[PDB]
Amino acid sequence: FDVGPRYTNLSYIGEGAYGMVCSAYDNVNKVRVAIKKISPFEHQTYCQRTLREIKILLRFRHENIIGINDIIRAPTIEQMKDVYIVQDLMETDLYKLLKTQHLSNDHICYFLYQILRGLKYIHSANVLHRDLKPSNLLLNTTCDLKICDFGLARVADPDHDHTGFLTEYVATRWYRAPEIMLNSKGYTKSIDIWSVGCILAEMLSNRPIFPGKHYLDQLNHILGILGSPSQEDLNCIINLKARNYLLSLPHKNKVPWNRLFPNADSKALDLLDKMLTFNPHKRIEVEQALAHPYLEQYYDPSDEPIAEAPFKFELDDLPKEKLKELIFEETARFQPG
Numbered sequence: 400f401d402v403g404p405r406y407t408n409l410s411y412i413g414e415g416a417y418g419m420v421c422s423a424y425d426n427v428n429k430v431r432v433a434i435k436k437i438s439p440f441e442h443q444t445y446c447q448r449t450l451r452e453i454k455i456l457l458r459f460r461h462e463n464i465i466g467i468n469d470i471i472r473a474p475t476i477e478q479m480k481d482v483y484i485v486q487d488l489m490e491t492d493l494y495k496l497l498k499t500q501h502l503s504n505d506h507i508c509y510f511l512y513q514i515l516r517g518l519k520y521i522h523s524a525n526v527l528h529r530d531l532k533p534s535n536l537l538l539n540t541t542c543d544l545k546i547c548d549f550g551l552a553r554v555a556d557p558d559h560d561h562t563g564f565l566t567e568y569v570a571t572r573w574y575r576a577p578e579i580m581l582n583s584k585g586y587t588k589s590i591d592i593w594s595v596g597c598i599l600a601e602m603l604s605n606r607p608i609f610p611g612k613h614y615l616d617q618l619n620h621i622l623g624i625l626g627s628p629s630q631e632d633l634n635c636i637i638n639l640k641a642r643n644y645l646l647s648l649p650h651k652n653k654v655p656w657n658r659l660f661p662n663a664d665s666k667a668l669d670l671l672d673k674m675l676t677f678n679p680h681k682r683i684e685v686e687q688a689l690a691h692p693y694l695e696q697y698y699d700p701s702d703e704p705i706a707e708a709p710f711k712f713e714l715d716d717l718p719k720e721k722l723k724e725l726i727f728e729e730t731a732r733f734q735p736g
């Protein structure tokens with residue numbers, strides 16, 4: 400965990416596939432920070448996540464999105480085995496909080512607002528996060544919230560979103576929109592809105608709303624609550640295998656939200672309904688969501704910034720080696736000299 404002279408007093412915070420994150424003291428700013436150690440140069444996929452996250456986070460600047468303050472690596476490509484990413488330091492994440500803490504409606508409202516505020520900026524950049532979930536939402540001791548982990552992020556591509564039935568997908572299962580299992584590659588902004596809807600539901604009850612145990616079971620959970628899709632929504636799905644799978648299921652009634660969440664704010668459930676809409680084209684978009692009455696205490700579009708420029712619009716087709724220089728190159732600005 401050699402982070403050089405600049406950072407000392409390392410203290411473990413959390414681990415995962417992304418690597419491990421430790422607290423640490425920044426001698427130059429006297430402020431304590433968070434450091435993530437990554438060894439991506441082991442498999443090329445981890446290298447793609449590393450590169451997407453770095454490029455995106457370096458161009459992004461927003462209160463509700465985690466930043467990269469510094470990147471620590473060896474002086475030369477040969478000597479570089481690991482990359483250390485220095486980022487905002489926060490107390491906990493939504494996943495940890497939901498395990499043991501009941502959220503007041505005021506907290507649920509405030510968290511949702513900040514998630515959407517951050518998402519407005521991401522989407523304004525033509526970027527999809529694609530793996531929104533509680534563990535990717537960090538909070539500090541005054542409940543300021545920042546979205547992290549942009550490893551699965553992509554540039555939006557609505558025109559190439561269609562695919563076949565049961566096409567495999569990487570993003571976390573419980574937060575996948577129904578269309579992913581049916582006919583979507585997850586290349587439209589509506590995919591993130593679904594995830595935020597799932598996060599809202601989870602904040603209301605401290606339980607994942609759709610805890611599927613395997614790929615297709617996820618869809619079954621979703622339909623068990625929303626009920627069978629309408630003829631209109633069925634007609635929008637042109638792929639036969641996808642549509643006929645749906646048609647093969649016995650009819651299921653919708654479960655009314657106020658029955659699922661009897662203690663919830665009624666305005667919160669109206670917004671939930673709109674984010675967890677089956678048909679992605681009818682699903683609410685992030686700016687509409689921000690303007691929804693549930694968030695009226697906070698809504699101020701002039702205080703909800705968008706990006707100066709979008710992306711442009713691959714890391715899929717290059718060697719773990721090829722982009723080992725790309726990582727080295729993109730981290731160049733942080734090295735002395």
Ligand SMILES: CN(C)C(=O)c1cc(-c2n[nH]cc2-c2ccccc2)c[nH]1
Nearest residue numbers: 412413417420433486487488489547548
């Ligand atoms: C994917 N993750 C967890 C990140 O990209 C990340 C988290 C943090 C962080 N800042 N303050 C605390 C953390 C943290 C919380 C929980 C687990 C691991 C790190 C910095 N980058």
